[PDB]
Amino acid sequence: MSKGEELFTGVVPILVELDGDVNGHKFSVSGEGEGDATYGKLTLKFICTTGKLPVPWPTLVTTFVQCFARYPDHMKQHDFFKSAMPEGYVQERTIFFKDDGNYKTRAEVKFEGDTLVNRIELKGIDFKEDGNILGHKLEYNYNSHNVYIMADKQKNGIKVNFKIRHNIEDGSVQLADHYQQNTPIGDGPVLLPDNHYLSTQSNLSKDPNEKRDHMVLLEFVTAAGITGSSTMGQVGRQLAIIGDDINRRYDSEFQTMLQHLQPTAENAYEYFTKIATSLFESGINWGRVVALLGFGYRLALHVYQH
Amino acid sequence: MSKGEELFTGVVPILVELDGDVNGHKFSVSGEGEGDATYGKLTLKFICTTGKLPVPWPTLVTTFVQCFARYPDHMKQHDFFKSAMPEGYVQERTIFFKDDGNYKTRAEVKFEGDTLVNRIELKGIDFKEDGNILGHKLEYNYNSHNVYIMADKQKNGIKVNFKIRHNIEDGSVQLADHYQQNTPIGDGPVLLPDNHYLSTQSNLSKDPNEKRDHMVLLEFVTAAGITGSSTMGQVGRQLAIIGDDINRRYDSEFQTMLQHLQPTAENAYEYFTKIATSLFESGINWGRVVALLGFGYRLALHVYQH
Ligand SMILES: C[As](C)(=O)[O-]
């Protein structure tokens, strides 16, 4: 584990600032909320302080603080985001919108007193005015995605990528390919993770009281893709219980089958093939494949002996 | 072996009587010939003693003495038919002609002096008037079939079934599904067999000197299915019955194991290795190796497809 992990034991208040320029359109956004890393829960409201948002709100969702992800106990040595605190880290992204323009972003995430703050710059270029983005054709919703993470040892951080699918109004999808890197601000030791991912569920809503153009954003974030030793041990013990049952119930049967069949080494493969064929001609399912496997095994045991 | 087995060491003379009713048409048939169980050979001539046979001769072939089957030496303890002699046995059949009527038959087969006699009653119902049986559309020939035999421990006899394929003159086929049971008449000890079959070749011809409506029937009958390659069909059927149990009993558990384990393609082999290690730490036997293979198989399916 790390020391920064300790800053996230409770609910942490969050502030966000963003300056944006997409195809020459400028805009600013301010955000507030709270993060609860213990339960991988994130609550945010954003207001555009410069008028109407010039791009659809959903395209800013990935841009609008992965240090709040819930890491299971067996994966806590892979939480780079919290290990880099409180000094913080820099988050850089390039987002390619298929058949359209791209965003580039730079963001500083660090503590300021008790508050986690995220200052962001965004420059978008090459967007078609008829396109999904500037044409405002995206639906006000969000799908779940996996955020895949790798260590970037030469840069003392992590490399990240994922592919967002934005629902479009006619029923189609607009892809946004995210390439991301996160670099520590402090000179202290951070944690480099094994490959894993963040599983992310997001929800977009409105504040009925809010006069400005805005977005209410709720996110659930959980680390996964690494399975602990306890689960592997557990599956192993299940298989053993199952294997002992299979053995007690069927071993002598498979043995007498081979006794009657009297295979030699020269006819084993042939016998096996023909047997597999009349078994499977009434159908194939998982258990039948397993019976054929146990038969194959006993067949090999049988020819190997003698 | 048995004592009744010794009644068949040489050539045995055969008499057959049949009284029949199909859809109200009555008729009688008398038959004579010889059986030589030593070489699995059977030679019979039948005369309709009431005029023209109201049904095609091929449909009566199976009804017209399996104690003449050649049982190979390594299988003679599986010969229920001969173990029941001379006291004899009762053979009952229901024969379903697909898309047509059925035959019901009862037959007593026993020695009387030096002669093996077979007395039979046959009743057919629900036969279509223009159909293949009453329309006399079967060809005068016969295919080879296997007669599948299993013990019937509560009835102290055997259960038997098979499916005959009758060639029809227009080029189609008429299936005749046989269900059969054999019950000892005497109180002597009979042989109850393991599962096996009789391979039956038949030929139908005429006597050029016979003016009455008649059939000459030659049959070759040999038992197999106990040892060697002839066991392959049964082993497949066993595996299918077993595979289906394994599937009913464990398919869902293996699925919930893989879902919880969340293997990726990149960690699949490692997870598998670790799983194998905690399984085998309590021991190895055949059933445990089978369970591991079953897990491995479903695992390769899960990752290879995603
Ligand atoms: C499962 As199949 C099409 O080989 O009977």
UniProtKB/Swiss-Prot annotation, chains A, B:
Keywords: Chromophore, Luminescence, Photoprotein
Effect on the protein of changing residue 168 to V: In EBFP1.2; shifts the excitation and emission spectra to shorter wavelengths and increases quantum yields compared to BFP
Biotechnology: Green fluorescent protein has been engineered to produce a vast number of variously colored mutants, fusion proteins, and biosensors. Further generation of mutants led to more stable proteins (at 37 degrees Celsius for example) with brighter fluorescence and longer fluorescence lifetimes.
Effect of mutating residue 66 to M: In Citrinine; leads to excitation and emission peaks of 516 and 529 nm, respectively
UniProt-recorded name of the protein: Green fluorescent protein
InterPro entries linked: GFP, GFP-related, Green_fluorescent_prot
Coiled-coil features, chain-numbered ranges: none
Result after altering residue 219 to G: Suppresses the 399 nm excitation peak, leaving only the longer wavelength peak at 475 nm
Gene: GFP
Known partners and oligomeric status: Monomer.
Outcome of swapping residue 142 to A: In Cerulean; leads to improved quantum yield, a higher extinction coefficient and is 2.5-fold brighter than ECFP
Effect upon mutating residue 160 to A: In GFPB; leads to enhanced fluorescence at 37 degrees Celsius
Family the UniProt entry places it in: Belongs to the GFP family.
Record note on what altering residue 46 to L does: In mut3.3; shifts fluorescence lifetime from 3.03 to 1.88 ns. In R10-3; matures to the red-emitting state with excitation and emission maxima at 555 and 585 nm, respectively
PTM comment, free text: Contains a chromophore consisting of modified amino acid residues. Maturation of the chromophore requires nothing other than molecular oxygen.
Reported function: Energy-transfer acceptor. Its role is to transduce the blue chemiluminescence of the protein aequorin into green fluorescent light by energy transfer. Fluoresces in vivo upon receiving energy from the Ca(2+)-activated photoprotein aequorin.
